[PDB]
Amino acid sequence: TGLLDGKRILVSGIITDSSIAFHIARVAQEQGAQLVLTGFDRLRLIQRITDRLPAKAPLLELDVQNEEHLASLAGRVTEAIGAGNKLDGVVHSIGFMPQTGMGINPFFDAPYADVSKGIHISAYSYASMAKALLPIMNPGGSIVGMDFDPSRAMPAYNWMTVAKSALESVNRFVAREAGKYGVRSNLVAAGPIRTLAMSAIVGGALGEEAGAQIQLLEEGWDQRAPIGWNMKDATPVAKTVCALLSDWLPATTGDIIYADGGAHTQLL
């Protein structure tokens, strides 16, 4: 077995054990992948979490806003996996939007400096990670990023929706570059998952008419999904990412795969 046997895969975005990236890494290891991880601010905090993965993995620092971190990334990764070895997979599982761009802050009140930052981290860095890492990927490789369907507007998500729309567009252009390396680029559009990131905005709208809206949005998902949706279980999305990292979707690129219980295909 091992869906990902022999594959070398870089996984960004682990912060806690609820992190989507955490379960992607876990399942990938269960499936025989050898991992390199990146983490952002609290590397020692991140290391404690990554120590509970089924296997050891080098953990490197990557602030996606940091051009020195980006400039050095490929060298550092090759140091980690061994000269003459290349990556077969890359997982981008990172996002951020300042508080003004989400939750209860009026949409019109977000200053562009804040929006711009969120777009830098959530959308542009998909291209910047691909730039850094494509020169060290094997033909038949796979880059995957995380998306939340922004094709319709909704409460609370606000400027992050705009950043995910940008990301979808970025992914299509990354695919054009990656194809030259024989590499695929896709997003997985996940349904809601109880993660540190959304506890943030769920917590940010406690007394408020955005918290109630978010609750309604969540309940509608499991209702719409023909197979249901369990926000407490990240593994169906981790498995989907691993599917795209495997050799089993070899003809799919510039694309989006919906791991959302089928909710997006149903009006109600």
Added chain:
Amino acid sequence: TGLLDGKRILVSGIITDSSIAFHIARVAQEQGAQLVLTGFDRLRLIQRITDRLPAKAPLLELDVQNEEHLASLAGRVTEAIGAGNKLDGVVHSIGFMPQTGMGINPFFDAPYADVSKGIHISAYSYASMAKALLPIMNPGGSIVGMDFDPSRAMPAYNWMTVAKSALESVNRFVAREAGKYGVRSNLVAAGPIRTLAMSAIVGGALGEEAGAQIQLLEEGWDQRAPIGWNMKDATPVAKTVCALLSDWLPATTGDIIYADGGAHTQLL
């Protein structure tokens, strides 16, 4: 290994060894599935083909327009796999449209009797196969059908485009029914594959301004696809179907997966 180890899967639509269903069956067997096959008119012709699959499989007759064939299908399948065993997978890989509905026949000149027949076989039968077989599927099961992206109009495809639009809609409703059984329903939208079905219409427009259009359509696909597209190689699509039949896309239903080299994501 065996992506589909232990799974029992019914595969319809084999007619020659170029058949998409043929390569789906082949790869599924290579991955440890145990198959039941159905074939339509020339069962002895179909048997010769299915004898070159890596393993033996019961082959049953199914004319999807035949209510007796449909009424008896589940009993016949259970006879084939053994009382107390159920299906984990179903592949619908069938289509037909009379000559008036495609190629060089003017779009307006197709009589509804012909269109209706093509829709019966290409779209409605997805629901009729699901009706027959869901009562004999295991939770966690997967129904897959074959699609050709009908979201834009194009030369030659004509009324089959309409039938695939109907199919996409049917699939979303099948997913609502299948979810009750814990079963997924999805389509794979494939790029063009050199199959008996399209040699038919490719052959039908030899001297004509539909044959040239078809040639242009085919060349544009490999051009648009960031990873290219090889119309002579059905296995990337077979692998995609097997991915959906596996446990690795467990959160995806009522949906369409594009196995088209990423062509649909690129304008040019």
Added chain:
Amino acid sequence: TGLLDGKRILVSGIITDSSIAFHIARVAQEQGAQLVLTGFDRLRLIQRITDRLPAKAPLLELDVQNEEHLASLAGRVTEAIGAGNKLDGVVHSIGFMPQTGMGINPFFDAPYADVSKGIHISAYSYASMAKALLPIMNPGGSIVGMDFDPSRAMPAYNWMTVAKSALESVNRFVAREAGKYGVRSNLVAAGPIRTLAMSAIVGGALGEEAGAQIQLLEEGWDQRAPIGWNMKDATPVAKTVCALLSDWLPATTGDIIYADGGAHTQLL
């Protein structure tokens, strides 16, 4: 004034004064169009209704399933508008699906004979009306049909959803034919309107878990729509149809215009 001054427009689909076609005709007359109407079974019933339009209009019989009615249509229309005059506009505002294909009947229990009939009337007849009438339309003309967004599945709508998916596809192919005449073809996807057609299925699910679902669907529309939605007011949709019949959307064809309060652009 007169948005449609001097234009000759055929309007099908009037049955009562709640009919979408009724308000399309009314607004068109208010805007200076000269109309020809078609009606289906109860022509004397239809005549009583059409007598309350602001102006007189010839009313002709057209059963869209009747090849003699279709074969004779263009001659009959030209008789009505005068030799040497041609149509500038055509409104298709017709649909039907037998009771088995909607409401509370299980999706799987609709026989294809019933589905086929609904598709004939709701989707195929768009092409058959275009075939009949394009040879009598002026360059710069406009064909419009009525749609209900079938891009997602939903309760109760069932097989009519499939028929509207087919229609969307038909419209794209009609546009290819109409372009040769300098004629546009588009659909207007309306939000729900209290019409005879949906009182039918609203009435059909009185005690039932499809009636409640329909109520929920309706309430969500006005909730989702940024400008709200009033199911009791057909005129915003009539005005939209007239916009497409006018010279003010001259570059739009094979397309769908959403007159739905913007509901389709919002998740909630």
Added chain:
Amino acid sequence: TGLLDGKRILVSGIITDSSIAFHIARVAQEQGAQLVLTGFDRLRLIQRITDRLPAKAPLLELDVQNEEHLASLAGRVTEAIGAGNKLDGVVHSIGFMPQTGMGINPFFDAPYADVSKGIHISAYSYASMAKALLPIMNPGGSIVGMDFDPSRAMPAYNWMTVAKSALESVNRFVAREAGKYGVRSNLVAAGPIRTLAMSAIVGGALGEEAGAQIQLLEEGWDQRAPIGWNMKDATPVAKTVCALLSDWLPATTGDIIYADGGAHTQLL
């Protein structure tokens, strides 16, 4: 007559007489609107152009990156139209992306500082113009912006595609805000028009494999469009904008109208 009789409409984005905004203003005046215009850097250059409009209009300076220009805009507009008068329409017809984000510059080589600037001007400013001007719009009003379908990737357009994807998302959120004022927000997705903006990138890829790609893209548009497409004629798009500014699409918001000859609805 006068489709826009009595309406007060602000039109941004005039730079030359080939400007889409120029023809929008012109047609709007021909239809009885009273205009206020805004212009960006070369106000005296812009004034020469705007002097050839059918009627006089106040012209104000607006650099959409300038928070003082934005903060003062509504006061300045009301000064221009008269205390106690409000706007019925707003046209956003502005975009910019630095040279690194388009044409022949590799996609990966655009620094975020450049991308961020283009997104600020092309996408974010749609929200910032709505913020400024909604407090001075009448119920039943209309905000329109200009889009180029970014749903698929393509040569040369590069990071502007990403900025238009963001814009589409912004528009859906603007619609949620505007609905509170009884105001509609929509985009018009135009086919290619020979304008100063694209002569820029057409000129930027003279000897190069992006210039040839752009030529191919342009030729395919008129080929795909069932009614053809004339890149030299901006008026079909101006008329479409005026349609959305009128009372004739009263139920359409958060939406995109395609004024592209129907090219987007056809594969080829």
